[PDB]
A paper describes a structure:
Coxsackievirus A10 (CV-A10) belongs to the enterovirus genus in the Picornaviridae family. The virus is considered one of the major causative agents of hand, foot, and mouth disease (HFMD), which is highly infectious and affects millions of young children annually.
The cryo-EM map of mature virion displays surface features typical for enteroviruses, including a “mesa” at five-fold symmetry axis, a “canyon” around the mesa, and a three blade “propeller” at three-fold symmetry axis. In the mature virion, most of the surface exposed hydrophilic loops, including the BC, EF, and GH loops of VP1 and the EF loop of VP2 are well resolved, whereas the densities for a few residues (including residues 1, 10–17, and 297 of VP1, residues 1–10 of VP2, and residues 1–27 and 69 of VP4) are missing. Similar to other enteroviruses, CV-A10 virion also displays the canyon feature surrounding the five-fold axis, which appears to be shallower and narrower than that in EV-A71, CV-A16, and poliovirus type 1 (PV-1). In our CV-A10 mature virion map, density corresponding to a pocket factor can be clearly observed inside the “pocket”. According to our mature virion cryo-EM structure, the pocket factor of CV-A10 is mostly buried in the hydrophobic pocket of VP1, and its main body forms abundant hydrophobic interactions with surrounding residues, whereas its head forms hydrogen bonds with residues near the entrance and middle position of the pocket, including Ile109, Ile111, and Asn226. The major densities bridging the capsid shell and the RNA shell underneath the three-fold symmetrical axis region and pentamer were identified, and the possible residues involved in capsid interaction with RNA could be Arg43 and Arg62 of VP4, Arg18 of VP1, and to a less extent, Ser10 of VP2.
Author numbering:
A (entry chain B): 10 to 255
B (entry chain A): 2 to 9, 18 to 296
C (entry chain D), G (entry chain D): 28 to 68
D (entry chain C), E (entry chain C): 1 to 240
F (entry chain A): 51 to 149
H (entry chain C): 1 to 48
I (entry chain A): 150 to 198
J (entry chain C): 145 to 192
The structure:
């Protein structure tokens, strides 16, 4: 009863047998911006079914030595779908996301992944240089990896210089191969401003880090893909202009 | 009515709790299918198992106060956000300038970085002295220079007339100078982590130094001189302390595990990763 | 019963204390209420 | 004017003093606030949340293996899997928890703590563990016939892979100072050990070595006081 | 006397502090006031008034030709007449406006701006112009098939020679700091371009080159805050 | 040409949403705009040189720029004033002399 | 609720704030009211 | 500000003076008290 | 500078040490010519007396 | 990544081994002639 579940948004639907409940981040639902909180005076557009729906990205193959991956959400969807086209033609953006991570495996496999939504996730430079002018900075494509995602060098600090053990202070869910085959989290829109640009700013990141490694026996299936599905939810756009993708 | 489809909470609530929680007496239970101990950590919810359910407890009415742990008493303590060195005698010089950043160094930075968003007022205190620690009856001027105001170009500059820019004239032997500051951000909260770029355009993969910077945190400049027409010969050092009051905090996050290499950037050195813990002898022996 | 000597409210003191807690949002951010005495799944 | 007499404590700057200061911007109204979810009021909310606790330290395990502790089929019965001291303010496992970092800004602490163990092994593996808490007065138990004499839970791998060991507040004083070592061993809370109740059984052609992740948090009786400045971080010089 | 304790902030002169000072003339009644028309209360009234805006700058035009921008018969269709960035606190056209000078005493600004164009050509000349505002994210449009994608008005020379382009407030933050350049390009408002919709048609024996005067002001949502001291004027030494 | 500024508003030109604006207008009043103190004059006194012994300064707040440029955006101003005298040595030091 | 320590009222503080606007005199000093939605001439 | 005049006895530390001093721990609640028998109030009990 | 160092707080290792930033530890800055410095202390014992 | 742009269901093997993909009626005309090929490709329903 609680294990089984089905979502639906737009024309897309997801069904799960073995799922464990659902995480609603910070106890609030996504909403449209209220009149009091609004600032920009133009009438925002609310596409609904054309934008809000599940989008599936390419799959990551999880291997015994895998170090984990991450994504930036008002990034991955900027070049894909109708959501991506509204984002390039509009200067202002607001929405929440419903997030779903999926990893199958047999009852003979063992391991655990930590799925976490970590707002304002800022990757850092890796090096001992204390001089600000010569200090390393983490690339463009490492900061906004796009649809393909990026992988951690040293997941223990989350590339942020911050302990992964405390990452449970963020909306998070475990996917444990013996318990559940998927993790689901709904994130309301959070930021210091009512709207914000989609192409410049990344509200929050996602982190799938293999805490307990992947282990199995000879003869079992070796290839274990990981797939993420994200639904932009309760979207808004404003500030229409010509397309700027970068 | 002509078309139907155009025709179209939260979870919890906050309880005011003045004191720590009490404990109620419980006894042994033997029965089936009631199990407060078994939890599922996969759901992302922390264990709701309490004392009373796990073992037998007595009746304890707890008088311990919870007040001292509020975020508004946690930041009520003042700390050193910057120190500026002024030498009026060396060469020309004559003034000192300090761009306002409370990330300047550690203890207060590490506290404020356990929240992503903070809205608050501030109170600055200026402790000034000689390099030798002694005090001498010289008058100083502290001028605040909001973003976009022209900076002083010299000790005699007209910038110091201060018809607009607020100033503080105080002699050096007097008690420290103290002022209140409002919440000046153009946004609705300060944010200590901004993932994104301040501008549009191309972003090289060689030098990204534009990355990470949030313009909403730039409060401008704080300048200081000593008021005379002739250049005094002395060295001088000004420590700046700030209380942080009327504070609100959002979306907490973990503390810094690693030593801070840079002021504006969360860089660390990946060879030296500290493994926050202390090393031990195997397991299954505790000290 | 505090006092403000200026007409600018941000210059005031710690104002009035308060006691408020809803750890429920951090502790149990789940959409299906879990009874604490019953099996989660 | 009104006669007055100044007192000791004049012209002193007390950093924690609660006063008013002259405002620098007369007639200033700040930017209006908006709704941001996740507002925190007290740090105790932050404390009740479970965080990854490091048990395995040693000189080995490198970065992330420190979080995991092994369980495997044991030849000799009644064997000890792992142990550690439960003082959160002491150098050790609790430094990785976020309750252990927030209690280092405070001198004293009072309340009940809870430790959660989740089993990451395969679905087909079974076993029973005994996790026990022994209040002070001796070193860690040598055998679990001694360790059963304290507060303990017998936990059975199954669906719902997590169990919760609560460790009640048991101390003569209302509070315990977080500093340990030396004569401050007076305040030691105790030792929690983790034993094999039966064994770790696994079918053929299935991994024979698994991991238990450990976790820690506080409960609603947990409080702190006497806020101090933490020792976890140092600075050699000004940060440019 | 009454016990008292002095605090930090004693014997300091804060130039903006609101206090009372000892009067130098006891029992002084000032000259009675009379009615003078034109009393101003807030500077926002002063801001809403339209003022001449300089567009043509270059190295040419000398003194007063800087105020005028030319319109003339174009051979190639769909041509750009003029453009400029709409940040009032930025060096450029808005320095000649009185809204642009009053927003340089203030750090931040929020509100809608309006730009007025009046056509000084002859009665017998006709034409249509397209004036468009493009919110940030790119440089000025290359062609007006791009420029139409933003907020724009199509304006037709006629009786009532003036048109008003309002440029709505469209920003993520409630306020925009008036400083620009560097990392403060984050706050850029946008670019307003002025295009030929059709052409500029004139009968025979009539001047073939005319001028559009441009204008600027604020609306009732426009506000400012954080009063600073302006950079527009300098002084090399005391003024005898 | 009429000499009246454009009365065109937001709501009329394009489609707008419902925005209830909480931004404060207070800081722009002329009475908070001049509440800030400024330097209207500086007088040099040398008691030791020759005879001399006193300094005289005819009161003009047009003496120099920043405050002058503010007050000259109105033709007529009625107001009270508060003067503050910051005195020091040429070296900036202070000495217990009465003035 | 301000205070004056002297009997000379000009020695007081900023007194009470006020909000007053009639930009109509600067913005539209015209003797024939122009309806904002209709043609001026 | 409010006019005032300082008096003799300014800046003196009288060890028996009964005053208030600035607290070093804002928002501090002490450990709750419990019943301890033998509480004394005046020294005269001790004397008898 | 008078800094109070509660049990378990790191002690100053030198005059220039970062220990003196006092983001938490309460401090008293007072000049030497001023009147004495005076503060109130609560009952800080972990016990009841 | 193209195929997700249409109507789809993500289905998970488990107890209850069957899933149902409904394919809504989506056509300009009220009816579709069953003949296909040639110019009758106008009536094609789609690809699953
Ligand atoms: C007379 C001098 C008064 C100075 C008043 C300035 C107050 C500044 C506002 C409070 C500080 C804002 C928070 C600071 C942000 C960060 O430190 C950096 N900008 C981001 O790295
Ligand atoms: C103990 C010294 C007190 C001095 C009191 C003098 C106050 C003077 C009245 C306020 C200033 C009036 C405005 C000044 C006018 C202009 O600066 C010039 N007279 C015109 O160029």
């Amino acid at each position: 009863s609680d294990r089984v579940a089905q979502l639906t948004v737009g024309n897309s639907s997801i069904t799960t047998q073995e799922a464990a409940n659902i995480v609603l981040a910070y106890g609030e639902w996504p909403e449209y911006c209220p009149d009091t909180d609004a600032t920009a005076v133009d009438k925002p557009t609310r596409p609904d079914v054309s934008v809000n729906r599940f989008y599936t990205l390419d799959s990551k193959m999880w291997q015994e030595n895998s170090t984990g991956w991450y994504w930036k959400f008002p990034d991955v969807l900027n070049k894909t779908g109708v959501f991506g086209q509204n984002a390039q033609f509009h200067y202002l953006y607001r929405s929440g996301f419903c997030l779903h991570v999926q990893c199958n495996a047999s009852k003979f496999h063992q391991g655990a992944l930590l799925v976490a939504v970590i707002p304002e996730f800022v990757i850092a430079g890796r090096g001992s240089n204390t001089k600000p002018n010569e200090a390393p900075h983490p690339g463009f494509t490492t900061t906004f990896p796009g649809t393909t995602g990026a992988t951690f060098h040293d997941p223990y600090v989350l590339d942020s210089g911050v302990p992964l053990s405390q990452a449970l202070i963020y909306p998070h869910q475990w996917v444990n191969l013996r318990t559940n085959n998927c993790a689901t989290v709904i994130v309301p829109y959070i930021n210091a401003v009512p709207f914000d640009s989609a192409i410049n700013h990344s509200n929050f990141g996602l982190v799938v880090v293999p805490v307990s490694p992947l282990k199995y026996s000879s003869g079992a299936t070796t290839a274990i893909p990981i797939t993420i599905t994200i639904a932009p939810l309760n979207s808004e756009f404003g500030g229409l202009r010509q397309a700027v993708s970068q | 009515d002509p078309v139907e489809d155009i025709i179209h909470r939260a979870i919890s609530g906050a309880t005011n709790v003045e004191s720590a929680a009490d404990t109620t007496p419980s006894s042994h239970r033997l029965e089936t299918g009631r199990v407060p101990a078994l939890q599922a950590a996969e759901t992302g919810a922390t264990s709701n198992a309490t004392d009373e359910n796990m073992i037998e407890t007595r009746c304890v009415i707890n008088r311990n106060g919870v007040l001292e742990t509020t975020i508004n008493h946690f930041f009520s303590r003042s700390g050193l956000v910057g120190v500026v060195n002024l030498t009026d005698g060396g060469d020309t010089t004559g003034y000192a300038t300090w761009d306002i950043d409370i990330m300047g160094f550690v203890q207060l930075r590490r506290k404020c970085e356990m929240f992503t968003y903070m809205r608050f007022n501030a109170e600055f205190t200026f402790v000034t002295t000689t390099k030798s620690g002694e005090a001498r009856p010289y008058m100083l001027q502290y001028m605040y220079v909001p973003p976009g105001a022209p900076k002083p170009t010299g000790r005699d500059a007209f910038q110091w007339q201060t018809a607009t820019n607020p100033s503080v004239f105080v002699k050096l032997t007097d008690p420290p100078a103290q002022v209140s500051v409002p919440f000046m951000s153009p946004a609705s909260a300060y944010q200590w982590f901004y993932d994104g770029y301040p501008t549009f355009g191309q972003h090289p993969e060689t030098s990204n130094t534009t990355y990470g910077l949030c313009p909403n945190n730039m409060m401008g400049t704080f300048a200081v001189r000593v008021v005379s027409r002739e250049a005094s010969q002395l060295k001088l050092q000004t420590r700046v302390y700030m209380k942080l009051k009327h504070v609100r905090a959002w979306v907490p996050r973990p503390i810094r595990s690693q030593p801070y290499l840079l002021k504006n950037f969360p860089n660390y050195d990946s060879s030296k990763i500290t493994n926050s813990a202390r090393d031990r002898s195997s397991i299954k022996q505790a000290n | 019963t505090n006092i403000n000597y200026y007409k600018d409210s941000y210059a005031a003191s710690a104002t009035r204390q308060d006691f408020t807690q809803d750890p429920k949002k951090f502790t149990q951010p789940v959409l299906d209420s879990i009874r604490e005495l019953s099996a989660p799944l | 004017g009104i006669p007055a007499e100044l007192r000791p404590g004049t012209n002193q700057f007390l950093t924690t003093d609660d006063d008013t200061a002259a405002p620098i911007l007369p007639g200033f109204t700040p930017t209006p606030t908006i709704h941001i979810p996740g507002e925190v009021h007290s740090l105790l909310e932050l404390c009740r949340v479970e965080t990854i606790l490091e048990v395995n330290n040693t000189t080995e395990a490198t970065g992330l293996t420190r979080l995991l502790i092994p369980v495997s089929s044991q030849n000799k019965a009644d064997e000890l899997c792992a142990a550690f001291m439960v003082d959160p303010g002491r150098i050790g496992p609790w430094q990785s928890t976020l309750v252990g970092q927030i209690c280092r800004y405070y001198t004293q602490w009072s309340g009940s703590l809870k430790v959660t163990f989740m089993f990451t092994g395969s679905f087909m593996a079974t076993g029973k563990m005994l996790v026990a808490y022994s209040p002070p007065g001796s070193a860690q138990p040598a055998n679990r016939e001694t360790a059963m004499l304290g507060t303990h839970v017998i936990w059975d791998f199954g669906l719902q892979s997590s169990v919760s060991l609560v460790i009640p507040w048991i101390s003569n004083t209302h509070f315990r100072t977080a500093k340990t070592g030396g004569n401050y061993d007076y305040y030691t809370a105790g030792v929690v050990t983790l034993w094999y109740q039966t064994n770790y059984v696994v079918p053929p052609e299935t991994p024979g070595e698994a991991y238990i992740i450990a976790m820690g948090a506080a409960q609603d009786n947990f409080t702190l006081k006497i806020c101090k400045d933490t020792d976890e971080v140092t600075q050699q010089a000004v940060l440019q």
